[PDB]
Symmetry: D2
Subunit: 334 residues, 4 copies
């Protein structure tokens, strides 16, 4: 079963399909010049309290990240990210291929990067022989299931800005961080210049948006989107998914349920005597499992081992995860 | 009204939305490792009588073309296309950016390229100082609304193959060519090596497939797809659309209706005394209209002028175009 | 014999070797941070009466062209050139690979492009779906041995600027144009924004400079130079070559001699009854030769056939070409 | 004074100028189709006891590295290097920009990488979502002035080969490693697949070669060289430099002298009570200096500080360094 393989193993929320049906009549001008796209863009700007932002819509989170970062840099610039960042490990090098720029990893505590580590790797890089530090990407919630605190994300973004850098937030799971912290979306991303806003993992069929809070720094981003095939002609159907998910606060209720199920699973794993590899602050559970328990669990449940050198497996819960599924996975581990 | 702006102005066929609902239950392994993807791939292999083909699915036709062409070449190779090709004029240079290779236009008659024109531009290019001819892209039906005959597409592909070149077919509107010619899909592509198979324009919500008839020549195509963000995690939803549209020949009924409405419009405007710029062989009608007549028509219908140096406007008919819409367009053109 | 293969088949001028010896003592700060580089940069600025220009030095004419054009554009821009341009046909697509941008050929008369042809191919290209016209490259003297007149080059540059475009001049053979026209270097380039200044073909050992007349439009050009390996550590030796060749106008005397030998050859060929393919306005002679005569000439002289479909061969004369070599070639053609 | 800024601050050896003069007569076929290029290539193959190798010549060491690595990979592959590698820190990201591939740093001891560290970072990287490990670059002697022992380089290359990876050696200072170890050049590179062979730093004017020991793995390398402007038309002059430097062991005498001066300087610094940051095994001396002493030395000697966060400065000795220069630097530090 793929019930815990990823939150992208989940189906789509019925309200998303309903939104697709609602816009499925009559002709519509293509490529985003339609009222549904305008409505969805305004919904995202309002949610993040960023009335001056531009909003683009891509089909995957990989695409959202590549478009944001490649529009931020020239090839002789330098991009920074954590040592567990999706852009670094799970996009087959897409960001580097499109940007032409080096992607420099930073030591992190489960994705949480110290401002001092960034400062150390940016210092003294002004010669023509050096890639030029330009933008740092962080992830919220992180790829190891942690959440940046309101204070920590504000301090990191402010410190990066003081160094003359831009900040990108990979919010493929931003809804899970917002629900976990009970703060505003804007507080959860901390004055970032650009944000990949995840939809796919939170109940869409597909779709990951780009909130460009400071458009002056990303000139040409719409051309970059076009050049990699992510400007949809039938754009009403990507936009309608976001409208349906954000209608009435549904997106944060979806993420809160995913988080609650992850908490149930994590508590159950600890009750079995197992050790968490990372604290369950979001909708992802990382647990230490020996080889045979892993292979026995794998006969019933598909789970990811993010690091081949560490006996740690990952469970991910979604908007559609049930208490019965959690308890059945735990029974499988016993 | 956008009723004739493009076939991508049309909504999605009801069977497509039904297919989305049918696969929207339970968790599913992601990134194409699911039975619906396997079913859709087999539907495409069967339609094109290509049992040895691999099948990939991208979100747009631009993406399909970029993935096919960039996977065929190294940066020092040379790609050829017609002087009206979508890859040349309407993808913001995406194919060139991703492949790293020069894209060389060939003189054509409404997209129909002579084999001799290709051969002339391929001759004598073997020195280290020259981009190395590798693949030619043709479009079926063409961007100017013409269809390559079965004989013509076979001679062109045969000439390219005799010269050692690969052939890509941009079949964004392959269903319209097949319906117009009443030949098999394989006959309509003439032994080509790779084909972008259009879905969006023929009634899907999103989705354009890549039929790789000779996989040995496109090593790494799956990495190219991943690197530009076109490997969907919830792949069951792109696949379900293709399975539904190809079930029982629906795709060709959609295209036949679009072609028939184009016939009604084309013959009707000729009856008005207006003149065609190109023969209506598919679902696109190109009509000579001066600037003032165009501005008067633009008050009721959005239509594109593909060439700013030519007083020619384009109407496109779709699976959902009605006789009432065609006749109202004729009343506006009168 | 390679006497007429190219002007880059010639040796290096004695003054160039003397200049290399002159700077070959003691340690010197690297990467251009030395007085010889400053002296050479000033010599080039003075020759082209461009006191506000920046000057870079690269190792080949291909490199000079790539650095200039790639620094001018983003990947979604569009570069224009003539249908015989070196950047198009003889750099294995280097400019396209490094810039990421489409290179669009323009019909020309032996490299001389009409302003109207540029204007036609730039019109109406403002949509997100289109590569964005940015810079046109012309060649002076052209790859077919013609010279842009002072009036023609000024008018072409003025039209390109009125269209919002930049202009690059590939002056791999700028010295020959200047000597042929008896005008100033600045008049021969017509207020262009960036110029590749040829040294190699006019008697250097290696070296081709970039005169950046409007640096604001080429931000990052020094990083582009560094990134492709064309920032010499021992920069005193590239600079010394240029200083020696330009001292006292030697560069123009070298080119005038090359042009005079080309005229001797061209008129002698016409006296033999042969027909020129292009008028000999510079140091290159293009002559029609049947297959029979060509395969003979090839046993005694290496000559280039630029177009495989046309019975045309090219002779190139250099600063070191002698009247005896010219007359012996003419005697071989009897 | 630039006496210790770098070995590329040194002038050119007299034998190099003699070689340039010797080949400077008559016309010569261009782009490497001359006997001097053949002679130089044979000299390099003989020095490295690699009769099956192909040999290319570029103008800089940055270019040599970029051409070797970019020809080894497709964009979805992964390149590895040490955390102090020139390709990583001092080429403005050129290798990444050309290859399109991620460049992954490995923890090292002054550039000496443990085989286990490579193996750890290569493990489990087979999914479509991952950059695909392909080639590791090591440097000999290293950027921190250390030499790989014969045993260590052989074990590292064998370990890499068993993992299915290629090995590139940046031998910008290979002559210094060979002289320090008193082993053969081939033993000093340990069966590597491709080697950048430094000439510039060992007394040439310009020029750094590529020894392609296994050409089957670098298909298209000559096109890559052409595309970044590093195929010299007047190729006889780069080839003549290499032939002159390698005749009769001159290159190793130059390197042995540079190493001897580095030893004099290093022993002198230790005698002053100063502390080395790295052991002086080659021609580079890395010494800890507090701010006061560094500021006084910088008024008198130009020296590099490789890490802005460490109070460590670098002296480099060359073929032309004299005992007087070393002793005066030591006296200045007093």
């Amino acid at each position: 079963s793929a019930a815990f393989a990823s939150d992208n193993a989940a189906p789509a929320h019925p309200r998303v399909l309903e939104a697709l049906h609602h816009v499925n009549q009559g002709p519509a001008p293509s490529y985003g010049d339609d009222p549904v796209t305008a409505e969805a863009a305004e919904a995202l700007r309002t949610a993040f309290e960023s009335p001056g932002a531009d909003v683009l819509f891509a089909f995957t989170g990989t695409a959202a990240n590549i478009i944001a970062l490649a529009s931020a840099v020239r090839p002789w610039h330098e991009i920074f990210c954590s040592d567990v960042a999706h852009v670094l490990v799970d996009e087959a090098g897409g960001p580097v291929r499109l940007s032409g720029a080096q992607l420099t990893r930073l030591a992190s505590d489960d994705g949480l990067i110290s401002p001092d580590e960034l400062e150390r790797r940016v210092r003294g890089r002004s010669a023509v022989h050096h890639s030029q530090p330009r933008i740092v990407s962080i992830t919220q919630s992180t790829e190891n299931g942690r959440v940046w605190s309101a204070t920590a994300v504000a301090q990191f973004v402010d410190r990066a800005h003081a160094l003359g850098l831009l900040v990108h937030v990979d919010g493929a799971r931003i809804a899970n961080a917002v629900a976990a912290l009970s703060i505003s979306p804007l507080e959860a991303i901390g004055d970032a210049d650009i944000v990949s806003v995840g939809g796919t993992k939170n109940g869409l069929m597909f779709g990951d948006a780009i909130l460009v809070r400071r458009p002056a720094h990303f000139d040409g981003i719409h051309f970059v989107q076009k050049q990699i095939g992510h400007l949809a002609s039938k754009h009403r159907f990507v936009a309608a998914q976001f409208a349906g998910l954000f209608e009435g606060g549904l997106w944060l209720r979806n993420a809160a349920h995913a988080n609650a199920m992850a908490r149930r699973l994590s508590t159950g794993l600890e009750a079995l005597g197992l050790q968490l590899a990372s604290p369950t602050e979001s909708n992802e559970v990382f647990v230490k499992l020996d080889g045979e328990a892993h292979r026995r669990l794998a006969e019933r449940y598909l789970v990811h081992q993010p690091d081949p050198g560490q006996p740690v497996v990952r469970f991910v819960c979604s908007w559609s995860t049930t208490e019965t599924e959690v308890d059945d996975a735990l029974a499988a581990l016993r």
